[PDB]
From a paper:
In order to understand how hEAAT2 binds with glutamate, we determined the structure of hEAAT2 in complex with the glutamate (hEAAT2Glu) at 3.4 Å resolution. In the hEAAT2Glu structure, the glutamate is sealed by the tips of HP1 and HP2 loops. Specifically, the α-carboxyl group of the substrate glutamate forms contacts with the side chains of T479TM8 and N482TM8, and the main-chain N of S364HP1 in the tip of HP1. The amino group of the substrate glutamate is coordinated only with the carboxyl group of D475TM8. The δ-carboxyl group of the substrate glutamate interacts with the side chains of T401TM7 and R478TM8. In addition to directly participating in the glutamate binding, D475TM8 can also form one hydrogen bond with the backbone nitrogen of S444HP2 from the HP2, which contributes to the close-up of HP2 tip. Moreover, the backbone carbonyl group and the side chain of S441HP2 interact with the side chains of S363HP1 and A394TM7, respectively. Taken together, three pairs of hydrogen bonds, including D475-S444, S363-S441, and S441-A394, are critical to keep HP1 and HP2 staying close to each other. Interestingly, the S441HP2 is only present in the hEAAT2 and is substituted by a conserved glycine residue at the corresponding position of each homolog. We speculate that the unique residue S441HP2 probably provides additional interactions to stabilize the HP2 at a sealed confirmation and prohibit glutamate release from the intracellular side.
Author numbering:
A (entry chain A), B (entry chain B), C (entry chain C): 37 to 148, 162 to 195, 229 to 507
């Protein structure tokens, strides 16, 4: 047990903290009248953890976007890389939109302005007038009686969408610079590494903060049965989203573009799928999916050796669907109804959050803060999903490993002629 | 025609967009009652263009000022470079002040707080207490009844003057660092190049945005005759400013400092002046003005080879006068009366905007946003000047080519002894 | 006298400006009814100096913290360096807390919200949700009647504590990067050098600004006797703090950790103490304290050669006590009572300000702006302490030279065995 617990010390501490917070909240529930100041003090370390995590989303957005869009090696990759990237973005967006549809349909949490103006505000926030203002303020439409007056007022909160847009453009241009801008790419690589070190430093404090957050959420909520039902229905929504996506949409895509049976493709990647369901890490399953594709499905080594390592981090269908579903679920437990602009923001920032989330287990929860602050939702509600994360995490990594495999198959099919010409010469 | 239109594709697209927007606005004028939401939708791509242009004025201010003030090579230039720089700044400021005088006199557009407090607020904004706040907020004096209470309140809007002051000081100090700070000069060179690439990317979208802006302005305004008269009088103001400046002030300066006939100097640069009136580009006329000065006017090759290439971009009298005139004209069509501090801000930011504006045709309109956001004016009114830009642009480049020529003559006269000593040894 | 005045030109100008401002304020006192606009104009150059100094506290905080925490050479120093650093921070914090205690006791200046919420707000500001917002805004608790509602509202003012925390973490992580991040360390070294050049540029303007500030403060205040008494009692508070600290706390520490007579240690450093009382510069006395320790007290050359040069700038007990005392004194003349969070902020930023303040004479006043803007106090009141700085400065540098000497003795005692082992091998 000493090697068992000491192997993944962070995981042991996080599980112990979650259990300790849950049991302490349950025990404190016995004192039915509770002082708001006392519950504030109990949840305060959770606030500290949330504040140190939200403190770093701006340097992470900047450095991550710049570093990723510069270190693409597009010319070296070729058209194979472009096909892989298009497939990655397409499937991630499909997964995010499917998740949004499923939450807005099932609405777990609801049991408990003009749309045109909302979309125009979305487009306005996508192009902020000022970067320093966009770091903490979003513009919005307000109509107040004086036929009716409408103007633009700055509401507080990070303008995540606008910053992401500007720094995607910035990274693209700086990559287009080429061998120049090497100094600035190195500067932002160093900045990103420093911020990741800070994020790990925070993650070591995470057990105590999560324990306090869960204790506060348990002691605060009125009816435990209502929240249990909401959590169960949220998990059902995520599971249905993953099943539909990774068992219908991806097979349908692979059949449309390749005219081949996707169920004959499934058997080839069954071992990779099981390993993902066990390892709960897309990166760990990577050698397994190489061997499975290369020997069972006969995919060429060039296309798999490119697609799989990149898709193990960039291409995460399940995490995207999970993040969209859970962001709308956090919105729905609070009673906050989301405008069209906020729904589109959830979709886009769920595509971005999936890309950022590394293949380490339980990173979607960390990247969730991107969506939560983009929409402006109470970030404290993450602990509820922390409670049941792991079971969804296994399914998520299974789905996105299946997505990687189908992408490898599709890109190989669309590049059979090119590889034939290369081998002939 | 295919080579005609395909040669300057951006110019073809911009002219086509301006004509299309004007004709579409004229056609939509037939539906006299028009919905504010519909006109908002029509002008929305114009808002997107304006927002992407205003989004980049802060990185342009920072990177441009730093790069320019570092890459001066003052020691290599000598006293000849200092004389050239002094002449450039002096004539640019004279042109800007003359333009301000002429607009405040003729007031095209008007047909349609204590001054001491205004100037003190100007000096306060020149030295901001905080850079991050100066990026989006200016301080101002407010007097409200309670002998009378006066305090300082932060009004929204970029503090362009304060940022320019701080980063001029920053660039000067970093240049004084010398061979050190090479890394930071390289960093800011890369940043400036990236932002210029983004500006070009935006400029390719410019035709659609300008078309929508002109359509919105045509459909919104009440009487077309009033706006036509205002535009005509604004063009008359710019033309009178250019005539007075480049036919009186510059010849008077050259006669005062050299005791020589400036009209004998004019004939030497007549070919350069005509080429500028045709090419509409100060950089393009540059070989012509070299040959004209060097052979007709006998100016030494050292002084001309230094003055002309630098003055082709730094020294723009006509663009400075144009930008001051047009900023006050935009203020005057809106009914906004300008305090003394705002007038001085217009003058200073018109000197800076002329320096920044590259010798490519129709760049003063892009640099105009510096002045418009420094004073806090509706940037959408740029399209009105876009309509009649080119005719003023030809005169502007003619005037500033004349300014370059007179600067070369003056600097040669003030450096006859130094060049004589150099040649003797 | 020409060499006398021309030797320290800045000091001559500052003393002349202080005397000129005092005499001009005294003369203007004869016109008892004075216009608020006229006194505003008189003190305006003081406002310009204060604004240019406050303008640079953010780049100084960032660059100084990053540069210092990277250029530590912890591995090369060894455990001797760690012991020296621990002693430095411990004694600086003790001095700051002693100063806070002494001002809150004697309260020079007073003659003229829940504490839990205050401390929670302190901890919240220590971890800001946004860096760009933390650059100019602090969060605070507000309770307004509707049992009672409490929420968080953003009050204006720099969040110095949060920025210091984040950039201490940033510098620590970037130092941990090692030979990587050399580019970013070089970038921030260049930035720090540039900002120091700007600070010197401002300091050359300091005489006029200080003269105008003292003139405004003399003409504004009602009773000169009251302010004279307050200044005298403030000086008495600083002197008592220095006496208690450097004659009880440091000797007591050295006796506790070494079991040796600290008064036998005092005689060894008497010459260094006198030189500090004369030179008014900790760096200048440095060779004197080397010779005194090395020959009178027999401290080993390794430990002294490490401790003394580092402690001449990092370790300033007297400046820390002075800065805490004077920040609370500035708060007390204005009638502003300080919450617990503001007192802790004064203590922490007084520890930081002492570290930053270079060993040049009269730098504590410049670093005082860190504390004054951290707490949000009128920075114009610095001139009152400027009037009587020098006499306190001599005592301050005497006390912190004594602190350096006691640190060298203590670190040598705690490292006798290590040096014995090194010499034996
Ligand atoms: C699930 C239902 C809603 C179907 C939706 C799926 C399609 C809309 C998307 C998903 C994957 C996309 C494919 C992913 C890969 C590519 C290669 C890519 O081809 C390129 O243009 C590469 C550049 C080049 O050819 O040089 C874009 C088309 C295509 C077939 C995409 C076509 C559109 C697809 C099939
Ligand atoms: C149009 C009416 C209002 C006359 C206004 C023009 C003058 C006020 C300005 C315009 C050009 C300026 C001249 C431009 C060039 C120089 C060289 C320069 O000399 C230097 O000090 C260079 C440094 C050195 O000598 O080492 C400054 C003076 C002078 C004659 C300037 C003197 C003032 C001038 C004539
Ligand atoms: C004035 C009154 C309130 C007494 C307060 C003084 C003590 C609380 C502080 C001041 C100096 C500190 C000492 C400064 C130096 C060190 C070495 C340092 O030892 C280390 O751990 C170095 C790391 C290592 O051993 O490798 C920390 C303990 C100690 C004795 C500190 C113990 C606590 C001290 C005595
Ligand atoms: N489960 C993901 C990691 C991120 C997440 O849990 O959302 C994977 O390894 O594929
Ligand atoms: N016409 C200017 C370019 C900038 C502007 O049009 O204002 C020139 O080439 O001299
Ligand atoms: N007197 C200090 C310098 C900083 C200050 O005066 O506070 C010293 O030289 O030790």
């Amino acid at each position: 047990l000493c090697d068992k617990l000491g192997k993944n010390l962070l995981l042991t501490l996080t599980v112990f903290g979650v259990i300790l917070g849950a049991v302490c909240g349950g025990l404190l529930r016995l004192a039915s009248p509770i002082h708001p100041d006392v519950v504030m003090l109990i949840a305060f370390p959770g606030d500290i953890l949330m504040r140190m995590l939200k403190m770093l989303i701006l340097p992470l957005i900047i450095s991550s976007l710049i570093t990723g869009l510069s270190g693409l090696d597009a010319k070296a990759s070729g058209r194979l890389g472009t096909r892989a990237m298009v497939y990655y973005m397409s499937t991630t967006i499909i997964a995010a939109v499917l998740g949004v549809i499923l939450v807005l349909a099932i609405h777990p949490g609801n049991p408990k302005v003009s749309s045109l103006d909302a979309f125009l505000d979305l487009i306005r926030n996508l192009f902020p007038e000022n970067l320093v203002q966009a770091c903490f303020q979003q513009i919005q439409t307000v109509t107040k009686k004086v036929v009716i007056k409408k103007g633009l007022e700055f509401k507080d909160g990070m303008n995540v969408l606008g910053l992401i847009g500007f720094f995607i453009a910035f990274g693209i241009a700086m990559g287009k610079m080429g061998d120049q801008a090497k100094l600035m790419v190195d500067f932002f690589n160093i900045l990103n590494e420093i911020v990741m070190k800070l994020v790990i430093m925070i993650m070591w404090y995470s057990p105590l903060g999560i324990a306090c957050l869960i204790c506060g959420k348990i002691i605060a909520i009125k009816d435990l049965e209502v929240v249990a039902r909401q959590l169960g229905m949220y998990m059902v929504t995520v599971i249905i989203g993953l099943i539909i996506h990774g068992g219908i949409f991806l097979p349908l895509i692979y059949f449309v573009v390749t005219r081949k049976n996707p169920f004959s493709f499934f058997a080839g990647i069954f071992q990779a799928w099981i390993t993902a369901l066990g390892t709960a890490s897309s990166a760990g399953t990577l050698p397994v999916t190489f061997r499975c594709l290369e020997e069972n499905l006969g995919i060429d080594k060039r296309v798999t050796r490119f697609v799989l390592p990149v898709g193990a981090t960039i291409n995460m269908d399940g995490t995207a669907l999970y993040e969209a579903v859970a962001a709308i679920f956090i919105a729905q437990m609070n009673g906050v109804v989301l405008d069209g602009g906020q729904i589109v923001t959830v979709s886009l920032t769920a595509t971005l959050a999936s890309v950022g989330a590394a293949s380490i287990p339980s990173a979607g929860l960390v990247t969730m803060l991107l969506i939560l602050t983009a929409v402006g939702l109470p970030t404290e509600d993450i602990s509820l999903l922390v409670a049941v994360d792991w079971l969804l995490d296994r399914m998520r990594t299974s789905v996105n490993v299946v997505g990687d495999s189908f992408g490898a198959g599709i890109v190989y099919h669309l590049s059979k002629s090119e590889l034939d010409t290369i081998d002939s010469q």
